């Protein structure tokens, strides 16, 4: 008569896109809609039991999270798990739920390895996956004439979730899976000046199509040094892999969008440097159901969670927890409707898999693997004003690059420079 | 009045050096000696609760083992953990015991990362550590004139415990920590013929001092291809990193020792190839207490475990579980004797750490980190007969290379070839 739902998420730390102070309300909203739908779990009273994926220091732990997951299983026997979003938290809990034959839902866990559902069985990813980033880079290379060599630069703060790694892992593995072209990679550390000589050296030696996964400040400083070293959009192109748009403001207000402006007198040289630079982000949902969700989400989070939800790309994570939780109740209702129980995880999950769905994020497609298709946006500088704006859009289910508001991808040469220079890289 | 000891080991699979069918009796022996020692835990009745580190398929699992470790904690509250031996099993259980403030003892878990006792607190390694292999390689390079460049080749079967990786990880990290010389590495797959062209190419380009971690058959085939390509002990030297002496028979009988002989008519060429080859293994204990232990161990395993314990280097793992368990009872008695309890894990562990001990394996030294020092043996071919015999010995506590039975390390040139060729590798 009641469905127990176990959550393993950062319950105290709010710095995470999947923090409970941001996913919690988004889940309240979804539970509220289920009670008001007579067609969704009729007469059921879906309860929730919570677990902190975070350890003592407040960060999500490859220990605290699985320890939390076990205490919830032996105390409540939940039918489904929610979270974690951290890769190193999600991996161990996923192996436990896959063993327990319990479904697992999360907007996080975007890494390449989570894709292996032979191990992470019953693990359905309703948020972005990094393998999906390979799809967009593949489409972007096919539709731009780069079929030889590209360069990747990524940094990580030590002891975090290693986000830029898994972003580049999912991009490297899926792009070489589909194009078999030369993809060079190099890891660095932002706070270490010793590396920047190495990076500028490798920039002009290891490729012209250059992708950088770094903080906004690191990517800016790199552009300044590139400009200083005479590297321009005629021979190079710099893709900041900034998926949550940290180098940008929200799409709601704060018009226009200037990432190169920093207020340090270097902004004048920075603007010109960013002429060779483009930013790859996620796609803000267009549907006005998103905007209503955000509104309800901000209200509900201030009221019940004493937290303020600012606008930004991060909010598709709580949004996808909301939608993914709706996707499950649908499938459980469907499973109950054909004589099955809420514990038929295999039946329940296969309903959710290979299935389109309409939630607050609009159209979302759970692929044959159990991973939401990810839509991307490409940002470019209008050489006139200097501000950035979306010029391309990648439908992830269709793998189609569509131009945005009839905008043209700025190129200093009138066309993209070639991924290989003239007479070799020498 | 009773001390609960939780074991997380392969209880059914016997292929592991830390299999329960081999460690179990070695533990029975150590428990038997404690009951007969009035000076060790007087009046105490040490209990044991067991847990299979292995999953369904019988291999040790990064999932089964921590799940096992939790049932033993919440059902018995043990005072100490024993095992796991598998790296990927131990790492998760280690983070659980370190959180639980419970000591963990194992002869396995040799990886570089287990060395970090800030994460794996109260984890005392009474067996070999791969970092310790770096120490022997360091001594071996310092006492042989190689201070420039060396080459490493390693292979692993997919889905195992990745043994050759962690062996090379511990060797690479500790040798560059101490010498800062160029150490080139290359992974390969034994069953893939496509790699052997790649390997022979790298042999004659990436160094002359060459270490190989592979199966005996793979290392042999490589030697034949090396000989075929005209690579001899005049310019090269090939160290098989065969720690458990899989390419050799037991030190008890089966005289003499020929790893190049295979009974396929290629043996004639194999002997000559192995003239440039040397084998790095662990050190068989000299003390006659070991030999009595083996005798009691084999009897006790046939009788109570219906398992037959063949002779060989693998047997120092159960031997070190035996000694490590004695090391703990000592310290717990010591801790009870100064008013402390069996749960004073930090006090107990610090007694065990930085401490020499006399056990069935003879002299063993738990270093400042909590890792038994590892003694290594170097084997070489007697050019007369072609058989291999120990020519060097590395005391791990003292880091001294001592000649064995007045034997000389055979060199075709009268001295070791230089780690770098004449006018470069070109």
């Amino acid at each position: 008569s009641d469905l127990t739902v176990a959550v393993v998420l950062p319950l105290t730390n709010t710095s995470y896109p999947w923090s409970w102070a941001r996913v919690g309300p988004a889940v309240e909203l979804a539970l509220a809609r289920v009670k008001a739908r007579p067609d969704l779990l009729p007469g059921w009273t879906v309860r929730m039991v919570l677990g902190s994926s975070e350890n003592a220091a407040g960060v999500c732990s490859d220990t605290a999270a699985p320890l939390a997951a076990v205490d919830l299983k032996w105390e409540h026997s939940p039918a489904v798990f929610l979270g974690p979003g951290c890769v190193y938290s999600a991996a161990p809990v996923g192996r436990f739920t896959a063993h327990w034959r319990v479904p697992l839902l999360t907007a996080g866990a975007p890494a390449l390895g989570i894709g292996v559902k032979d191990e992470y069985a019953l693990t359905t990813r309703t948020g972005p996956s990094h393998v999906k980033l390979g799809d967009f880079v593949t489409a972007l290379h096919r539709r731009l004439g780069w079929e030889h060599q590209a360069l990747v630069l990524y940094a990580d703060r030590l002891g975090d979730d290693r986000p830029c790694f898994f972003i580049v892992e999912g991009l490297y593995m899926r792009v070489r899976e589909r194009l078999n072209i030369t993809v060079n990679h190099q890891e660095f550390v932002e706070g270490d000046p010793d590396h920047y000589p190495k990076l500028l050296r490798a920039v002009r030696r290891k490729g012209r199509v250059i992708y950088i996964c770094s903080s906004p400040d690191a990517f800016r400083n790199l552009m300044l040094l590139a400009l200083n070293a005479g590297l321009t959009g005629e021979d190079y192109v710099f893709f900041h892999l900034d998926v949550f748009g940290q180098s940008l403001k929200s799409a709601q207000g704060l018009v226009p969008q200037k990432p190169w402006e920093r207020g340090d007198g270097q902004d004048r040289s920075a603007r010109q440097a960013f002429q060779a630079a483009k930013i790859i982000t996620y796609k803000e949902p267009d549907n006005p159901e998103y905007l209503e969700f955000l509104k309800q989400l901000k209200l509900l989070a201030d009221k019940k969670f004493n937290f303020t939800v600012e606008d930004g790309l991060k909010n598709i994570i709580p949004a996808s927890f909301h939608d993914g939780l709706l996707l499950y109740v649908q499938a459980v209702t469907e499973t109950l409707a054909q004589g099955g129980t809420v514990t038929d995880g295999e039946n329940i999950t296969q309903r959710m898999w290979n299935r389109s769905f309409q939630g607050v994020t609009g159209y979302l497609k759970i692929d044959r693997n159990g991973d939401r298709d990810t839509d991307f946006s490409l940002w470019d500088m209008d050489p006139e004003t200097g501000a950035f704006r979306v010029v391309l859009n990648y439908n992830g289910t269709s793998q189609e690059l569509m131009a945005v508001s009839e905008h043209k991808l700025y190129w200093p040469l009138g066309y993209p420079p070639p991924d290989v220079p003239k007479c070799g890289f020498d | 009045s009773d001390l609960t000891v939780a074991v997380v080991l392969p209880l059914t699979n016997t292929s592991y050096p830390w299999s329960w069918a081999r460690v179990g009796p070695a533990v029975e022996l150590a428990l038997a000696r404690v009951k007969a020692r009035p000076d060790l835990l007087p009046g105490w009745t040490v209990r044991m609760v067991l847990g299979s580190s292995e999953n369904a398929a019988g291999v040790c699992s990064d999932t089964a083992a921590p799940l096992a470790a939790v049932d033993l904690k919440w059902e018995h509250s043990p005072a100490v953990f024993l095992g796991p031996g598998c790296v990927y099993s131990a790492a998760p259980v280690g983070r659980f015991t370190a959180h639980w403030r419970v000591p963990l003892l194992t002869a396995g878990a040799p990886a570089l990362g287990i060395g970090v006792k800030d994460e794996y607190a109260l984890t005392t390694r009474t067996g070999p550590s791969h970092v310790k292999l770096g120490d022997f390689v360091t001594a071996l390079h310092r006492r042989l004139g190689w201070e420039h460049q060396a080459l490493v080749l390693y292979a692993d079967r997919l889905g195992d415990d990745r043994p050759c990786f962690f062996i090379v990880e511990g060797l690479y990290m500790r040798v560059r920590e101490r010498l800062n010389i160029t150490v080139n590495h290359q992974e390969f797959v034994e069953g893939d013929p496509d790699h052997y062209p790649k390997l022979l190419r790298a042999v004659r380009r990436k160094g002359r001092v060459i270490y190989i971690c592979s199966s005996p058959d793979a290392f042999r085939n490589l030697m034949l291809l090396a000989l075929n390509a005209g690579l001899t002990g005049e310019d090269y030297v090939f160290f098989h990193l065969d720690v458990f002496g899989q390419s050799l028979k037991s030190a008890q009988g089966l005289v003499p020792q020929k790893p190049w002989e295979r009974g396929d008519g290629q043996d004639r060429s194999a002997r000559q190839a192995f003239q440039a080859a040397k084998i790095i293994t662990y050190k068989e204990p000299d003390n006659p207490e070991y030999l009595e232990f083996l005798k009691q161990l084999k009897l006790l395993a046939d009788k109570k475990f219906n398992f037959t314990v063949e002779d060989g280097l693998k047997n120092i793992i159960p031997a070190s579980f035996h000694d490590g368990l004695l090391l703990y009872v000592q310290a717990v008695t010591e801790t009870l004797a100064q008013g402390g309890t069996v749960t004073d894990g930090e006090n107990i562990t610090q007694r065990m750490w930085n401490r020499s001990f006399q056990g069935v394996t003879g002299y063993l030294k738990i270093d400042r980190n909590g890792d038994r020092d590892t003694d290594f043996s170097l084997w070489d071919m007697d050019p007369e007969t072609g058989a291999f015999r120990v020519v060097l010995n590395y005391n791990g506590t003292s880091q001294e290379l001592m000649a064995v039975s007045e034997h000389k390390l055979y060199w075709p040139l009268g001295y070791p070839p230089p780690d770098v060729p004449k006018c470069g590798f070109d």
């Binding site: 890769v87 190193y88 991996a91 390895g113 892992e169 | 990064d62 990927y88 990362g113 990290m173």
Partner: peptide, 15 residues
């Protein structure tokens, strides 16, 4: 590819 040395012990964050 790359030789990941010291990068944790888990079949997820390793290469």
């Amino acid at each position: 590819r790359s030789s990941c040395f010291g990068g944790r012990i888990d079949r997820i964050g390793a290469c």
